Design a protein around this ligand. Structure first.
Ligand SMILES: O=C(O)CNC(=O)C(=O)O
Ligand SMILES: O=[N+]([O-])c1cccnc1O
Ligand code: NI
Ligand SMILES: [Zn+2]
Length: 331
């Protein structure tokens, strides 16, 4: 078996290898990349997402989210307080202000230490799931707005035609902005391109060990667990690498820099934080190997998760027994 220790693998495709997206995902899996839950892909030197980022300041962040923490430094939840709209130019200025800017630090490891020591005592503001794309329409390789759709994948694999669309989302971040422990809707893949700015640090649990993380989360967030059998779907729980190590949870970490792609694999739990002002673009996708994960994916039915239009069809076709109870939750 390839990659038996479930290490995060880093790939350097040539420009020729960068033409066929599906083929390269399959290649990465042939080398065991999916066992980690997360892979990094560094594009060939001849590639670019777009010409410049000099003209993005007028993009609107309609609902910036202030991420307010509760708990202890290594085990906390965050809730999202809605703030007034602001442009990306205004957001960048805010990110760089004395209140929100990245502190002096020696290296990525020093900054990681500072993040887990001090995150809960601040409430950074995140620009989240803004529908849109920053890939140039003429970028033909690994353009996240031009991928094959999940609906077409399901149709190709299972012969059923369904409603729904899937399109990319933009994320404008600042120091300490945080993504909570989660897998994707319907345990799909995700792909994330860091367009511009400071790094993003990722933590990931191998898919074969996801239930170990779930068990620890139930122990650490007992009220939340009683309220919902899939409460990590709420995407509000954080557990530090120190606490994961203390509890013997297998995981890995890596830092993504501007110009790099990350792929998360089905049922790969991930969490992380931004180092400073940045902009990322992400979208979910599927492959034939995803279908079995989609069939088995947990669901939130307590009503908290609240999810996209397109997920209806996924649950309806892949999980017909669960569908009625689940749809009761979306209402
Ligand atoms: O970048 C973020 O805030 C969160 N991203 C993801 O969880 C992802 O790309 O799958
Ligand atoms: O990108 N590939 O597909 C690939 C790269 C290297 C070796 N074999 C392959 O199939
Ligand atoms: Ni994700
Ligand atoms: Zn729930």
């Amino acid at each position: 078996a390839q990659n038996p220790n479930c290490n995060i693998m880093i790939f350097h495709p040539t420009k020729e290898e960068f033409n066929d997206f599906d083929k390269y995902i399959a290649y990465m899996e042939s080398q065991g990349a999916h066992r980690a839950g997360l892979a990094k892909i560094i594009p060939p030197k001849e590639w670019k997402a777009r010409e410049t980022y000099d003209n993005i300041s007028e993009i609107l962040i309609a609902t910036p989210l202030q991420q307010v923490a509760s708990g202890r430094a290594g085990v906390f939840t965050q809730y999202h307080k809605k703030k007034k709209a602001m442009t990306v130019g205004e957001y960048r200025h805010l990110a760089n202000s004395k209140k929100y800017q990245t502190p002096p630090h020696q290296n990525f490891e020093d900054l990681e230490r500072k993040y887990w020591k001090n995150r809960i005592y601040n409430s950074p503001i995140y620009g989240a799931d803004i529908s849109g794309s920053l890939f140039d329409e003429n970028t033909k390789q690994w353009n996240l707005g031009h991928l094959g759709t999940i609906q077409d994948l399901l149709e190709k694999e299972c012969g059923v035609v369904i409603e729904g669309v899937n399109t990319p989302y933009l994320y404008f971040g600042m120091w300490k902005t945080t993504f909570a422990w989660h897998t994707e809707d319907m345990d799909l893949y995700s792909i994330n391109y860091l367009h511009l700015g400071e790094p993003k640090t990722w933590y990931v649990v191998p898919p074969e060990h996801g239930q170990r993380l779930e068990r620890l989360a139930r122990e650490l967030f007992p009220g939340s667990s009683r309220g919902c059998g899939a409460f990590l779907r709420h995407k509000v729980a954080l557990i530090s690498p120190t606490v994961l190590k203390e509890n013997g949870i297998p995981f890995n970490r890596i830092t993504q820099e501007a110009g790099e792609f990350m792929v998360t694999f089905p049922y790969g739990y991930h969490a992380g934080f931004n180092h400073g002002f940045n902009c990322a673009e992400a979208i979910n996708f599927a492959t034939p190997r995803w279908i079995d994960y989609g069939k088995m994916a947990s669901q939130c039915s307590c009503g908290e998760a609240r999810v996209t239009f397109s997920m209806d069809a996924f649950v309806r076709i892949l999980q017909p027994e669960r569908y009625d109870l689940w749809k009761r939750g979306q209402d």
